Amino acid sequence: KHSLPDLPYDYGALEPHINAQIMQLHHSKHHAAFVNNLNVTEEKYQEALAKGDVTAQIALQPALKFNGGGHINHSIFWTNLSPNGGGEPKGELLEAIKRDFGSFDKFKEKLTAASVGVQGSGFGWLGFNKERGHLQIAACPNQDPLQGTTGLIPLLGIDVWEHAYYLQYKNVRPDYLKAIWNVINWENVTERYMACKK
Amino acid sequence: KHSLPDLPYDYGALEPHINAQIMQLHHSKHHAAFVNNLNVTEEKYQEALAKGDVTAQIALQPALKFNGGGHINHSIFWTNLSPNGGGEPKGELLEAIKRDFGSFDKFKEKLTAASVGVQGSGFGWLGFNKERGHLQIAACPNQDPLQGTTGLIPLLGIDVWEHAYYLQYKNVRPDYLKAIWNVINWENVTERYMACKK
Amino acid sequence: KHSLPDLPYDYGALEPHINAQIMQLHHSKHHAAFVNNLNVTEEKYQEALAKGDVTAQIALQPALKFNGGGHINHSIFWTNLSPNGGGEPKGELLEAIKRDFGSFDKFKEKLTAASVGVQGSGFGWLGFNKERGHLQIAACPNQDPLQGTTGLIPLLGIDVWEHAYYLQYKNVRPDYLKAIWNVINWENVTERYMACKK
Amino acid sequence: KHSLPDLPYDYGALEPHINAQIMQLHHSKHHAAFVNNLNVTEEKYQEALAKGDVTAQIALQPALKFNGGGHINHSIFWTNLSPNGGGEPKGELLEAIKRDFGSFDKFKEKLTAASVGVQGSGFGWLGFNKERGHLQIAACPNQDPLQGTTGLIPLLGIDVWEHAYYLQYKNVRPDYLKAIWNVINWENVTERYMACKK
Ligand SMILES: [Mn+2]
Ligand SMILES: [Mn+2]
Ligand SMILES: [Mn+2]
Ligand SMILES: [Mn+2]
């Protein structure tokens, strides 16, 4: 049974970049719905797996990918943010960033473009290619999780579903993108990156 | 050259069901963007076609369907609503509903279900299957237009992208679908239906 | 644990319509590969389901849908054929066919078109819409099974993957389609149809 | 207006790796069909564009990508093979391979894997990522062209549609991939690579 992870900060901890009403709705309603529905889908899949019912297994895949991805993506998103966040990463991460994208600034333009490039619902991701030994930017639709669908390890995710910025930025997604760089918890992204080495 | 069609009513004509802030943004911002992006992409397609650049034609397909479909979908959506609508449709349309979905209420549930069932951005539609000569409900992702990607003729469309309801209903998409039944322009839906019989 | 179902007839039982080399390869190699790989995927999913690993669950969905669909689709396909097959169905099925598509002949053109319309790998299907109480034709890509992905109940399936006709018909898929109507086991399709009533 | 390009060799020039019957059918039937369907669809798109019919433009997109991509993909495929190829590439290309994939053998495994991994119809590609300035392997479904749908520049493409090998290797797709390494036209692949450095 999955559960809703608490927010490492208060709903208002990210103001003014991301107002309090968003954080509250996003975490308590949207994220909670994924967990609730994820646990239900898993129970039904467990049942179908025992009865050897492949047709039921398959029919349940959309619900599983959507709610599971939703749970995975958001669990990561909350940690990718911090009221103390902002600025540039330090050490190996910054070095890797320079090594793969050129400069921290070009990295930003690339991740911002990948995030702005999403038509419909989705996420923009900075990941790690274990196979290639280097960073990599990618975009996923709806709630498709990065690792489950691309093999890449998630380091930083930017939610560009409309519920993530509309109440404050309306249709101007570029402003939300310009604003979130101020709350990026590079401390956590560095953690995940370092984890990719071991 | 495509143009933004004026609404058949004022931004506040659908209160309290769909507020004026949503209507103004939806039309003047979202839809207007589709129009311009549609025109630009079309012109870009004209240059690629003339130069026989198939790679460019193909790279342009996502924008064409997204902005083209966006223009098609919302143009229909505005006509599907009315400050003097709601209730049950009159004439043959209602009989088709009774015949193809059992009853008006059962019809509302199915379209509401098809609408609530969109994971991510999309539209729920009541269309006409010319081949079978009867009504048929379907859901389309993002801005994919009903007829261009399915052949069914659009009769009634329900925009379930988060920008269609978030400012008013937040995450409660079912509250938005419940309210919209009050402003359905049955007259226009009947017109479209009869057209599939011209 | 799934197993490879025996063929209701010998590999040459469908000549000349579908030669023996196809039937043998199709059943013993292609179909057998699905079963082998399906059982493996299910074991891995069972493991991931216990560890609460959603990322692994999701990553395994493509393998599960492809091999499970492959196992479901082909198990049905073998029964949809018969050396004694051919002709038109009788009783309720024929009646339903006339009622939903007009005539047996128009039904054929529709199923043939849906089958010819498949770009890439896939199947053409005649199914039953439990909700609507009537027949319905649809097409599925690759090994996506009918019921698991559309809710429709499979009655007759026509495999249009290239391995199903290339050795004999090469690129002329229309000849394979024209030929298979001679081996359609209407007795089995009638069975599945009647099952949809109960 | 598009035309079927002549092969740089005779239908039997690739024996025993890819037999003459496959080469003749692949080129004279499959590819030729893409060309004509591409030209017809393009002309149909011209009429829809002129009449500003967005629904028609969109309904035509599947044929355009399928026949357009089919023409793009096979035109490249013919140039990727040679009766005087095989072995290891010479010059910078090989060094890039060593650098991006570890070694030539490791490169073959990854592309062979990406190729065997296509479920249904598709292509396995070795492309160049201009943004990152390095090699990158990717797989594309059906006839979706590499550059038009991913931005990567095609260097080497391996057709894994069943018509590319069935008449000779039957279901044993791995035997076909193993054999094709003997006719890779490294000279052409190097040319394409250097072009991403012009
Ligand atoms: Mn979100
Ligand atoms: Mn909208
Ligand atoms: Mn098959
Ligand atoms: Mn081919």
Coordinates of N, CA and C in Angstrom, one line a residue, chain D residues 21 39 42 67 100 119 133 137 164 190:
Chain D
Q21 N 15.7 -12.2 -54.4 CA 14.2 -12.1 -54.4 C 13.8 -11.0 -53.4
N39 N 3.6 10.8 -53.8 CA 3.3 11.9 -54.7 C 1.8 12.2 -54.7
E42 N 0.9 14.1 -51.5 CA 1.4 15.4 -51.6 C 0.4 16.3 -52.4
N67 N 4.1 7.1 -46.2 CA 4.7 7.0 -47.5 C 5.9 7.9 -47.6
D100 N 31.7 6.7 -28.3 CA 30.3 6.8 -27.8 C 29.7 5.4 -27.4
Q119 N 9.1 -4.1 -31.7 CA 7.9 -5.0 -31.6 C 7.0 -4.5 -32.7
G133 N 26.4 16.6 -30.3 CA 27.6 16.4 -31.0 C 28.2 15.0 -30.9
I137 N 21.9 5.8 -30.8 CA 21.1 4.8 -31.4 C 19.6 5.0 -31.1
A164 N 11.7 -7.3 -45.1 CA 13.1 -7.2 -45.3 C 13.9 -8.5 -45.2
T190 N 30.1 6.9 -43.5 CA 31.1 7.9 -43.1 C 30.8 9.2 -43.8

